[PDB]
Amino acid sequence: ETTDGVYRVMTRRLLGSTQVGVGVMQEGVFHTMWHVTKGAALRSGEGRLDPYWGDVKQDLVSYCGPWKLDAAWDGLSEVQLLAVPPGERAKNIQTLPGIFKTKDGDIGAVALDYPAGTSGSPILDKCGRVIGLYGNGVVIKNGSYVSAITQGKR
Amino acid sequence: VDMYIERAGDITWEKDAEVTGNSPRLDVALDESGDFSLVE
Amino acid sequence: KGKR
To answer: What is the C-alpha radius of gyration for chain C, rounded to an integer number of angstroms?
Structure first.
């Protein structure tokens, strides 16, 4: 129920399902962006995953245990978005991040645009470690999207 | 509302991947509710 | 974004 990997986050009522996001299972903990689940519980097969840690300002939440993803963008190298878009299999997209310059420091940011239900897809370093999650960002003047590389603290 | 998860793959770097996107340098602000906004 |  908590096997390592990337997962779709789905919702259903009485009819079909909608993909609202994506997340990462690592070390028994499920990691996603807060705006995907609004911090509500998740079903995994016949099991229930309860929220454990989260932070709306970071737009992150973890289930079953504390945040486990510790790898950091090195501030230099190309990265890969492992995008899991609604209705499409996972795909890797390589990019050189730009930068969100904030009063509190710089954050890597990727100029890659996917449907909203791709939120929570992991961004990877060359060793395959998850350096953050995709899906909290800004829309620039021409309507295109730039996502922070959002990482928590382990 | 039934919110549930389903496995979608392994987490692996792809060798010889397609490279796309620019590297924008943007001034942003982050509010207490987690919204990023461009500084105008 | 189909900002989030």
So the answer is: 4
Domain that residue A106 falls in: 70-154
Specify whether A145 is located in the same domain as A80. Answer: yes
The residue among B1, B2, B5, B27 with the most chain A CBs within 10 A of its CB, best to mutate, is B5
For B38, name the nearest residue in chain C, comparing CA atoms only: C3
Set of chain B residues whose Cβ sits within 8 Å of the Cβ of A10: 3-6
State phi, psi for A137 to the nearest 5 degrees: -165, -145
Catalytic entry in A31, A59, A62, A147: A59
Residues A61 and A87 reside in one and the same domain: no
Give the CA distances from residue A56 to residues A61, A84, A134, B2, B26, in Å, rounded to whole numbers and listed in that order. Answer: 8, 23, 15, 22, 22
Resolution in A: 1.2
Cβ atoms of residues A101 and B36 within 8 Å: no
Domain count, chain A: 2
Which partners does chain C have (≥3 C-beta pairs < 8 Å)?
Answer: A, B
Residue A117: CB atoms within 10 A of its CB come to: 23
Number of domains in chain B: 1
